[PDB]
Amino acid sequence: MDDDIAALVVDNGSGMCKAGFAGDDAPRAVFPSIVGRPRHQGVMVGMGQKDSYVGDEAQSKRGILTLKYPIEHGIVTNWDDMEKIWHHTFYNELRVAPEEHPVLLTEAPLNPKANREKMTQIMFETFNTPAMYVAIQAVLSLYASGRTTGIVMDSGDGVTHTVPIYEGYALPHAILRLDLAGRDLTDYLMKILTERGYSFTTTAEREIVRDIKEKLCYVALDFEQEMATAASSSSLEKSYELPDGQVITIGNERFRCPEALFQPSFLGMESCGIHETTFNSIMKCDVDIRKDLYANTVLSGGTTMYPGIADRMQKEITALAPSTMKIKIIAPPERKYSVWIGGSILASLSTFQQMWISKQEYDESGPSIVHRKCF
Amino acid sequence: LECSWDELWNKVQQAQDLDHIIAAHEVFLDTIISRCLLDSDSRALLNQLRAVFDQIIELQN
Amino acid sequence: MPREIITLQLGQCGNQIGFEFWKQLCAEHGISPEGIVEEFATEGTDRKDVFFYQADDEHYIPRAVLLDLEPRVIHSILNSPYAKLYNPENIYLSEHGGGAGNNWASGFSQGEKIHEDIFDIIDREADGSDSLEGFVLCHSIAGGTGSGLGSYLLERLNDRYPKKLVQTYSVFPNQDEMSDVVVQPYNSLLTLKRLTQNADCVVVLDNTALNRIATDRLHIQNPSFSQINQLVSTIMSASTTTLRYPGYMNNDLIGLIASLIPTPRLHFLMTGYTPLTTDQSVASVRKTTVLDVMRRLLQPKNVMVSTGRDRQTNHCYIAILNIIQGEVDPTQVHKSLQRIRERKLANFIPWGPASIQVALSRKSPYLPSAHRVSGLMMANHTSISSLFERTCRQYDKLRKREAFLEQFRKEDMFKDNFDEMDTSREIVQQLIDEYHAATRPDYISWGTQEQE
Amino acid sequence: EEKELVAHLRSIKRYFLMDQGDFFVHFMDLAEEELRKPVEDITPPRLEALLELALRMSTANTDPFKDDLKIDLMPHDLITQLLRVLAIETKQEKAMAHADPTELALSGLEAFSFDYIVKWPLSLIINRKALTR
């Protein structure tokens, strides 16, 4: 068995970072993009507690740790803490030497060039990787869709982006960012659960409400019709038993919550609905490619896992696009992990092996290589 | 107590394997026993300490 | 269960000190101004029940009793943000509000008049204590309320709680300042008499030393009672840390003081604090070594007790206990003790084996400590008798002039005679003689009536 | 790097060559009274404690290699040790090497020496012959 040193694949989702080895069908490690540091340095220092825990390790130490997110609203806010999180992932979860493996990194759409440069510096100097590349997560999801022209809708927990891509090239003038994602919907679901009589106030209860949202909320094909059905029938109403045995009832919130995708004011968001964002992105695209973008709409990210989102998107895009425009929404069943799958796909190409930025190229060009070497 | 505890804790934080941990715990226990005057070499000292404790209890009563 | 301690704050100075102490304890324990444990105070490792009572499952109430014969101070306490921290049933305010007029005899008469009410309040506070050890009185000996009411309360507590320990923090008048209260030495003498007969331990707080320290170290030209109270609260916090930071040893006050008080007469305690730093120097957590700690502690500028220079008695250290707070290495402690012995850094009693005890203590986790290492020194030094002898000399100086004695003669405790002052002088003389004897091998017979 | 040759040389200068003159002044000022006692009356543990206390109390406490400085109690007085050193470069070295340690109860000043623990392989450079010289 040829132990081909697998390139590293790191899918940085808005909610969860997913990482693994090239040629895997899924990232091997998927953990929240959270780094927790002990809240009380004093008492647990003697018990071998780390000064900080990251991802799943932060969650396991959440009782004694103060958690920090080095990526905020999809944007990296602590480069040192993000590098520490990546180091923890590599050495504890993946248990690999980054000096021995090429590293494919993912980036958010519209990531600042300086942020790309700082990430490159950290990757080359801290991890001593022999080669690396930085790809836009949505681009990898598009590659996972087998397309070179289209718009990728990547929706994690913290941020949404719309990324038009043509003939393998993203269309930067038509890229749109929406600061509305799974976190805002989770807060809305928590609000509507409190209105329903289920009290969720702690970050643990907030996470419980998030799990409730993930399990019971769905996207209405017609938000108004589903709301009318829930108001007229309990068939959309759902009871939920709390771990203490308390039963809470959730009705239109099952579909009112994802209705915010079409009516973000339903969540109290001032952002445009998914239909309006799609329309604006199409109008921002070339007219000649607009047909193909409608025909190549790929759903990605954990926030695309909502049931019914595909039918609502189909209806809305049909009502919003030209009747002559071929609109095709691609909602992969794995679109919660589409980023990681696409990263594995992209990194598996033989022709891509020449696209990696090598450690030598980093040392030659410095962090600015991200703006100079990765195009 | 403090010295044996610090040595145990340092060894445990530095322990690389289970046999190292076992050895560190054995060393800790032996060190405490000696420092508690409980070793064979302190047996005469331990007996004298026991007689001192008995005289202390007699004085207390 | 913890040995709960009731804190008695007496008179203006005592009540201010008690209030600042309760503030400091709340800050160290992470208790909100309402008495509720803050959400960040998740380290349930402190023993509040030694010094605090729980008002609810969340609210910790200080086991503190604020006692004044004048209502002004109690009302000022009730106007602070910490008014909700304390159990209101543990708050006794004199209905007459007139105080003792800086007269110990008046304070004693007021305490006797409010004995029933005060003991009812004390019992109400006691029921909130699971294993109340006893009462700690914070007061001044020069005023009327803290001296007189404090003496009356001490007498009634000794009668009612004869099996409980009674420690006092007695603020002594400034001996370098001329007191405008010409009868202050008489009041102090009567209070010292009662402390000799009815108190088990008197912590002497000399306002002269507090003012001197504020001037030279805090650069405070006129030290306020509030600044002295904040320093005292820091000292009290350090003294209670072993209750607030539970460990293997020294978990109770009686265990700590047992080694210090060999005979009932040798009940005069000296204090020491370390590291002494100006408020501005908080920035640098100095890695003070045990040797460095011991060296700084030996400086009189760092000792929290103003003992007079006795020229007649060859005062010596009988024993020393250092309570050290912060990161301490046991091997460094051992080497420090070795170096101290080799350097003869500590003089021990001549009548028995004696050494410098060293205690290492943790800092409060809820209060950020600017210093890596802190330390308390407890020392028995025969020169503390010289402070008592000096108080006696001041008493004799006032009595010989009968200055301001008519105000005390108005109160029944001092109406007929000044016998409490003469008893104070005799007790201070016996203390001086015992302290001189305690430097000598004949201390074995010290305190025997044949030796008296 | 591993044997800290320059650091070892600086430590030797500070202690054996008395380069840390303020440290040595403080140590000798503090220890002269105790060292003045006859060797038979000197408690070696007391001398060691006083040495360590002067070291922490002198500017030798500022030496990062001060923890490598050890106290060595010569079995002979300073005069006999000096005679041995004076013989070392002379044919008398064998005679001074075989010279019994001076029966004179050496003062601590005369018995005072430093020792230095060198581990293998670093002990290859600070050898016992060099350390003894």
Curated annotation (Swiss-Prot), chain A:
Changing G146S: In CSMH; somatic variant. The modification N6-methyllysine is found at K84. It is linked to Dystonia-deafness syndrome 1: An autosomal dominant form of dystonia with juvenile onset, associated with congenital or childhood-onset sensorineural deafness. Dystonia is defined by the presence of sustained involuntary muscle contraction, often leading to abnormal postures. Some DDS1 patients have dysmorphic features, skeletal anomalies, and/or mild developmental delay with impaired intellectual development. GO terms for cellular component: actin cytoskeleton; actin filament; adherens junction; apical junction complex; axon; bBAF complex; blood microparticle; brahma complex. Changing G146D: In CSMH; somatic variant. It is an enzyme of class 3 (hydrolase). It comes from Homo sapiens (Human). PROSITE patterns: ACTINS_1, ACTINS_2, ACTINS_ACT_LIKE. This is Actin, cytoplasmic 1. The modification N-acetylmethionine is found at M1.
UniProtKB/Swiss-Prot annotation, chain B:
Belongs to the TUBGCP family. Component of the gamma-tubulin ring complex (gTuRC) consisting of TUBGCP2, TUBGCP3, TUBGCP4, TUBGCP5 and TUBGCP6 and gamma-tubulin TUBG1 or TUBG2. TUBGCP2, TUBGCP3, TUBGCP4, TUBGCP5 and TUBGCP6 assemble in a 5:5:2:1:1 stoichiometry; each is associated with a gamma-tubulin, thereby arranging 14 gamma-tubulins in a helical manner. Gamma-tubulin at the first position is blocked by TUBGCP3 at the last position, allowing 13 protafilaments to grow into a microtubule. It is found in: Cytoplasm, Cytoskeleton, Microtubule organizing center, Centrosome. Ubiquitously expressed. The chain holds residues 727 to 787 of 907 of the full protein. Component of the gamma-tubulin ring complex (gTuRC) which mediates microtubule nucleation. The gTuRC regulates the minus-end nucleation of alpha-beta tubulin heterodimers that grow into microtubule protafilaments, a critical step in centrosome duplication and spindle formation. It comes from the Eukaryota. This is Gamma-tubulin complex component 3.
UniProtKB/Swiss-Prot annotation, chain C:
GO terms for cellular component: apical part of cell; cell leading edge; centriole; centrosome; ciliary basal body; condensed nuclear chromosome; cytoplasm; cytoplasmic microtubule. Phosphorylation at Ser-131 by BRSK1 regulates centrosome duplication, possibly by mediating relocation of gamma-tubulin and its associated proteins from the cytoplasm to the centrosome. The modification Phosphoserine is found at S131. Keywords: Cytoplasm, Cytoskeleton, Disease variant, GTP-binding, Lissencephaly, Microtubule, Nucleotide-binding, Phosphoprotein. GO terms for molecular function: GTP binding; identical protein binding; microtubule nucleator activity; structural constituent of cytoskeleton. CDD domains: gamma_tubulin. One of its GO terms (biological process) is microtubule cytoskeleton organization. It is found in: Cytoplasm, Cytoskeleton, Microtubule organizing center, Centrosome; Cytoplasm, Cytoskeleton, Spindle. GTP binds at A142, G143, G144, T145, G146, S147, G148. Component of the gamma-tubulin ring complex (gTuRC) consisting of TUBGCP2, TUBGCP3, TUBGCP4, TUBGCP5 and TUBGCP6 and gamma-tubulin TUBG1 or TUBG2. TUBGCP2, TUBGCP3, TUBGCP4, TUBGCP5 and TUBGCP6 assemble in a 5:5:2:1:1 stoichiometry; each is associated with a gamma-tubulin, thereby arranging 14 gamma-tubulins in a helical manner. Gamma-tubulin at the first position is blocked by TUBGCP3 at the last position, allowing 13 protafilaments to grow into a microtubule. Belongs to the tubulin family.
From Swiss-Prot, chain D:
It is found in: Cytoplasm, Cytoskeleton, Microtubule organizing center, Centrosome. Changing A111P: In CDCBM15; uncertain significance. Ubiquitously expressed. It comes from the Eukaryota. Component of the gamma-tubulin ring complex (gTuRC) consisting of TUBGCP2, TUBGCP3, TUBGCP4, TUBGCP5 and TUBGCP6 and gamma-tubulin TUBG1 or TUBG2. TUBGCP2, TUBGCP3, TUBGCP4, TUBGCP5 and TUBGCP6 assemble in a 5:5:2:1:1 stoichiometry; each is associated with a gamma-tubulin, thereby arranging 14 gamma-tubulins in a helical manner. Gamma-tubulin at the first position is blocked by TUBGCP3 at the last position, allowing 13 protafilaments to grow into a microtubule. Belongs to the TUBGCP family. It is linked to Cortical dysplasia, complex, with other brain malformations 15: An autosomal recessive disorder characterized by global developmental delay, variably impaired intellectual development, speech delay, facial dysmorphism, microcephaly, and varying degrees of cortical malformations including pachygyria, thin corpus callosum and subcortical band heterotopia. Most patients have generalized seizures. This is Gamma-tubulin complex component 2. It comes from Homo sapiens. The lineage of its organism: Eukaryota, Metazoa, Chordata, Craniata, Vertebrata. The gene is TUBGCP2.
